[PDB]
Each structure stands twice: as C-alpha cells, then as structure tokens.
Symmetry: C3
Subunit: 332 residues, 3 copies
C-alpha cells in the first residue's frame, strides 16, 4: 500500500519521541497507533494554529471526528510547520478507514471528545488546578485512554488496561504537565499561557513576569509547586506500567514516562527553566546500567529520580512539606 508508506514517512518526519517505539509495536497495534498519532497530530495542528480565527476553528475541531469518514477532506490554509498532515489528510483518513472497525471506533470517539474539549479552551486560560487537569485530560489524558483502549482491543494486553481509564488518564497527564512545566519560556515567547493562573498569580502579577531575572526566586517557587502537582501522577504511572504484559507495548509506554520523570527531576529547583535550555544530566551509576524495559528496572530508575528531587528540596520552599509527602507516598 503506497498510502500506508506515506503515513509512516509522515510519522518519522514528525515525531522525534514516538516514531521508533510506535514502529516497534507488535502486529496490528503498529498501524493503529501510527494512524492514531497522525490523526491527533492533524487535530493538534488545527488547535495550535493562531491564524485560524476561533469562529472558523470551532466547527473544524467539533467535526474533525467526522472528517475521518469524508474521503476528500483536507485543509489547505494552515500556516503551521506540520501542515502536510492536514494537506494530505485524505491519505491518512484512507488508512484510518482500512483499520479494523474496533480500532476506528476508539480513534473516532477520542477525536470527538478531544475536539469538544479543545474548543472549550480556545477562549480561556487555565485557572484552577482542577481546570489544569481538565485541559490536560482533553489534550493528553484522552490520548492515554485511547491508546489503552487500542491495546486492549488488540488483545495484546488485558481488558483491564483499557477499562481503567483513570490510570490511563494519569499516563497522559504526567507527560503533558511535564511538557507544560519545561516549556514555560518557549511558550511565553510564542504568546502561549498554560501555567494555571490560580497557582502563578499567588507569586506574580503576570505569568510573563517569571521571565524577568528580578523574579527568579518566586519563579522557582512556583516551578516547584507545579512539579509537586505533577508528581501526584507517578503512583498511577507505576500501577499502569506494572500491568503490561507485552514487551513492545511496555517499551512504548515506559520510555516516554521515564524521559518525563528525568525531565521533571532536571527542572526541579532549577533557575535554568526560566533562562533557557535544561538538559538531563546522566543518572546515578547503578541506573545507567539498566534500561527502561523491565518493571523492576523502571522502578529503580524512578526511585533514583525521586531521590534526586528529594535531596534538593529547600527548607524555605513553600511546597517543601508537600514535595516530601508525595515522594514518600511514591516510595510506599
């Protein structure tokens, strides 16, 4: 199939973090997840594009799930770097329609629900931590749920994996929150605001104020509060990973979680978050000897990163008691 070849070309051209682990998935999961990735990428590209007015955008978000069944549908007006997935959408939708119906049902349901949620947030910033969870559920939690439903529908994993939507949602939330935290500065420069207003406003008058070097102390305090919030999903991440029985699915799920945890640990109490590039420095000697492909190794890696954070908690930090508590819970 030349259209499937094109889809895999687009996957590799677009995804640095997931292309390899997706292409390594066993059997039918590989095409189902490749197509799921591309279709959500097309949806995201619409969401992100500030040249599409809110009034024009909402009906596209709302109806995107149905465009999967309109063989000629494409979008030619995107100004985004990845617009090829929208311009050549018929190639992707054709391959979506070639998936077994059980996978189509999952992918279309997720697109529909994600479209509704993305549309809700076009006109508003994130206010409370509860709203943060809602926004993250819409753009990432639902991805974890959809992937889990595909794993179960394929029979490569237990039915519990797709049924336990709270655990799957946590998988997505941990990744999205980590990205939001790490990307403060890049988002500030693109005029984007994802840090929850009810948290940041306790520190500064404007979210952009964290980029000013005179506010670095308060910035790092807010940073630490948000990291503490994200750490709450780690028990569910461990539970989720602990239930997987397929090696290719385990690799696909575990590697990105471990990269996120590494990233949160590097960002903890780190002024660099507000100043530029934060790179992961190599871990404890013991954990360098293992990779993230069996559960005891993944747990050890996670515990090492939790101690890297725990060790750095400033007594003066306003979240310090809470940071110790969640880490202690993760350890329990």
């Amino acid at each position: 199939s030349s259209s499937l070849k094109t889809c895999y070309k687009y996957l590799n051209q677009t995804s640095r973090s997931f292309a390899a682990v997706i292409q390594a998935l066993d059997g039918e999961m590989r095409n189902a997840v490749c197509i799921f990735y591309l279709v959500l990428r097309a949806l995201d590209t619409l969401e992100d594009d500030m040249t599409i007015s809110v009034e024009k955008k909402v009906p596209l978000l709302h109806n995107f799930h149905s465009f999967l069944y309109q063989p000629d549908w494409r979008f030619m007006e995107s100004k985004e770097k990845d617009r090829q997935v929208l311009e050549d959408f018929p190639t992707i939708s054709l391959e979506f329609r070639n998936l077994a119906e059980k996978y189509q049902t999952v992918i279309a349901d997720i697109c529909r629900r994600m479209g509704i949620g993305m549309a809700e947030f076009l006109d508003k910033h994130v206010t409370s931590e509860q709203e943060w969870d809602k926004y993250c559920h819409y753009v990432a939690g639902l991805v974890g749920i959809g992937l889990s439903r595909l794993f179960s529908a394929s029979e490569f994993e237990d039915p519990l994996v797709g049924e336990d939507t709270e655990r799957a949602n946590s998988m997505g939330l941990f990744l999205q929150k980590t990205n939001i935290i790490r990307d403060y500065l890049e988002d500030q420069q693109g005029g984007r605001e994802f840090w929850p207003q009810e948290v940041w406003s306790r520190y500064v008058k404007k979210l952009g104020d964290f980029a000013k070097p005179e506010n670095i102390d308060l910035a790092v305090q807010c940073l630490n509060e948000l990291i503490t919030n994200a750490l709450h999903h780690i028990p569910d991440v461990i539970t989720y990973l602990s239930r997987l029985r397929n090696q290719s699915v385990f690799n696909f799920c575990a590697i990105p979680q471990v990269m996120a945890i590494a990233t949160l640990a590097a960002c903890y109490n780190n002024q660099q978050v507000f100043k530029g590039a934060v790179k992961i420095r190599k871990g404890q000697a013991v954990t360098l000897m293992m990779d993230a492909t069996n559960m005891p190794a993944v747990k050890a890696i996670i515990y090492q990163y939790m101690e890297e954070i725990y060790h750095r908690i400033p007594d003066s930090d306003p979240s310090s008691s809470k940071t110790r508590q969640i880490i202690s819970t993760i350890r329990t």
Copy 2:
C-alpha cells in the same frame, strides 16, 4: 578442565576482539560448538587471505580443508598471516572439533566443504555484478549465518524453524559482510584488495582506486550511497530472522552485530570520511540510549532510529536518492 579446550579458548581470545565474549556467553553445548566453528573458519579465512600462498597451492587447501578436520596431525606451517597460530596448531582445534557431538561436526564440516569451494572460485577474479557480490558474500559470510543457525537448532536451544530458514540466515551474513566491505574500502585499497562490485564502481570511475583520489570524492560518495542502498535490502530478512529467536544468549549473539552494522551504515551514509579512513560510529538520539539491543522490540526501535538518521540525510541530487527512500520506506511498513 581439558588442556586442548583451554587452548582453543585462548586462540578464540587472541583472534577475536568482538565475537569472543558473546560466544562465551552462549548456553550449554552451543558455547563449545560455536567456539570451534569460529576457529575452524578463522583457519580457512587465514588461508584464503594469505597472498604468499600461490593460487595452485591454495586451491587444494581450500577444497580439502573440510577433510583436514578428520586428519589429526594436519597443520599448516607456511602462513605469513597474523592469525597463523590457528593453522600451526590446527591439531589442537581439530581434536576439539572431533570431541563435539556428531550433529555439530556434520554442520561445521558441511559449511567448510561449501565455503572452501566458493573461496577457491573467487581467487582469480574480482566481483563484477551485484549478483556476483551476493555469491561471494554467500560463500564467506552467508554460509557462516547458515552454519550458526543450524548449530542453534541442532542444540535444540532454538526451534528447528531457525535452522530451516537458510535464506534469512544467509541475509544475516550478507548484511554484515556488505557493511564490512563498504566500511573498509580504504584499508582494502591500501592492501591491494578489491571487493566493491565492478558493475557498480565502473559507472563512476575507471579504476576502483580512483575513489581514494580527492578529485573523485563526489563520485565516490555517490557510489558509496549506491552500495549502502543495496545492503539495506537485507534488513527485512534480518528483522524476520531475529524475531523468530527464543533463546536470550542466541538473541544477544545474533542481534548485537546486526545493530552495530546498521549503526555503521548510518555513520557511513553520504560520508566523505569513508574515503579518507576510519568512520566514528557516533552517539545516538535520546530515545536510542534508553534501550539496549537485547529484546526484539528494542532492537526494532534502534533500527528505525538509524533508518531515520539515514533518511533525513538523503541528498535530492544523489543518483540513488529515490531508491534509498524506497527501501527505507519498505523497511518501515513491513
């Protein structure tokens, strides 16, 4: 505890920097069987390569080598090669060969018999067509993969289907050998050896040595890229072969060299340094370092990362560019 076997492991380690440790890690009877297979093929290789041995002396040595396995006093004292201790003390090696179970002797002798004929056939001639390149690689490397695969299955650590699949075992060997030949252009040219297929190189230059000259660099790189594209064709068979394996020790032994060869092709792709000496197999991307080459899905993911490392660098102007994209695309969708 056997002094002759101890000596064979000494020779394995004197000669092999990169296979010895994974051979020694093999389960049960495969360990000795593959150690001995390595040393016997090493002795044959040393004869093939020794340019001080006249062709008319060399042909019978290569043809009859499999017979020497059953001649307890046979040795060869006239080699000038660096690995000649395996020929000079061949009786120690053949003694340990004759201590192997018959099922392993049968495989090893059969491969030696067939390899000797193939090696003898190529003494007077260079590789012309790509089909001849496959034939030569079959004789000196494909047959190694086939022999190993038959040893795995004879030991019963692997399913009989592993030894049965001679076509994909052959591809495993071809992939490694073509990678080596590609990488070692310059070392070979300085030793007066020509392994690049004439039907390919002669479309660029008048002599193969012409690629060593700095004025021919663009052409040399184009030919390099054409040969790499040829070698990438074995990757689907490599993936299928490795996917069938069920023994961890066998898996590590087979998968690690394939991944290293893919890493080598990626470092060599479109790389002028091939014609100036040694190519540094670089450090890979973030996702790559998160996994090792010891389970099949991780091996697949590593392979795909390297395929994208090549794909991203294909120059539009390269004469093989659509073909390189095509084979990578096939590997991705398999």
Copy 3:
C-alpha cells in the same frame, strides 16, 4: 506505617548505590532487605566511629543483635555523619520486629556473627591473605550470605541460593576486595590500612610507602597481585548470578558485580590508583549495546572485562602468569 515511611526515607538518604534497586525488589523482599540494610548500616556506623573507645565498642558490636529486640534501644553518642539510624534506632527496630519470623532469624543471625567478627578486628590489621578473606567475610561475605538466605526464605529464589553459602560469600568478597583495592589512597589519608600485610610487606616497609612516587613500580606490582586474588571469586559470581530466577533480585545482584569488575579492569596495572581517583573507562563496542539485566549479557560484559585485563598483563609483572591462569580458567569454564 509512619515508621516504615521513615525507614525508606533513611534508605534513600544514606544509600546512593543500593536504595533504588532495594526499593524495586518484589513482594516481601523489599521490606526485608530495606531493614537488613538499615540495621547493618547502623552496626557499621558503630564499627567505623573512632571516637567510641574499644571498651565501649566491643559490647555494642557483640550485643547489637539483641538491640533489635529492645524497643527503646538507641545510641546518642555517635559522631558519624549517618548517626540518625542510631539515634532513631527504635523506629528501625520496630519495623524489624514486624518482619516475618523467618526473616528475623536471618537478620539477627548475621548481625550477631558480624558483630563478633568486627570486634575481633578492632585490635589488629589484616596480615595474611587468609586473614583478608576472614575480614571480608565478616563485613561483606556475611551480607551476601544474609541476602541470599532472605531471597530463599521469601521463595522468590530457589532454596539453593541461601544454601550455597560459599557462593554467596564470594559475591560479598568480590565487592569488598574491589573496594579495598580501589580505595588505597583515600584509606591511606584516613589512617586506615586494609591491604593485607603479608602481601604488601613483600614490596615495601610501610603500606604508606606506596603513596610515594619513587615506589610506583612496586605499588603497581602489589596492586596487580591483589587484583589477581580478587579475580578468583569470578567463577562463583557467575555461578551465583546464573542461578537467579527473579528479575528484581537479578538487577539488585548483578549490577554491583559488573561495576566491581569494571573497576578492577580500570585499576589493573594502572599507576593512577596511587595518585587518586580512577576513571572507569567507556567499554568495548560490543558491550555498549547491552545492559546488565539478563544473564547472557552479564556474562558477555564480564568476559569482555576479563580480556581488557588480559590484554594489559605485562610480562615483567611478577604475577603475570597467575593473572593469565585465572582468566584462562574463567574463559574455559
């Protein structure tokens, strides 16, 4: 349990190398080994503290196994960095007393035997290679034996693991010897001598003489002799590791052994041992694509490190033949 939470806090704060792998252990092994670590660390903290007189220290070491059973016992006079495990010992011992009886038997047995052995060595240095094994047995071999007994008691591993005490002892001796070899200079400036006198005295008048630049050739020869001694434990290490069936136990056991082997290879015939800290080099290409989490990979990594030593054995070294011989035995087995 807030006391169990505290024990894990102490585990993470103290153990840079073992906290993560301990916490990753399956089922009942996790608490059993976390507690085993904390109590042995407490015992070690008493042993190490040069401000505690021998008069006071002997009864502390002898009676330590019984303090596990005395709910109010603590020690408030430590001047060591890790004194919290001593000052808050009742928290650790409460959790100890909550372990299954089968685990308590093992932990208290090792604490009793280690305390006795540690006390023997307060008044003396290590003389013979046999005394070196005895000392390492007391402070590391018994840890290997205790851990192996916990694995078998938990039934995550076969009975053989805890039964074969010689193999478990070798696991401990290999680590301990590697550490002592590596740490020559740091111990020399701490006023500590662990290199066996019957070996070093064949080279120099005083152990500290190896730190003097003019003595470097003799120092390196002695280093190589001791390395050769430690390599004799590798067959047992391979036998031990090859018997493990549990992934979490395998990770916990194999990684330290591989790091020790890498360290010995980095130290072999290396003058830097006597000038400070030794760089553990980037490994041979084939091994860089493997981790230490399955047995064939661990074998290949160990075998590769053996060849790195072998390659470096110079003919003029007085132990050269012995070093080749042990490596040759490990290759062929």
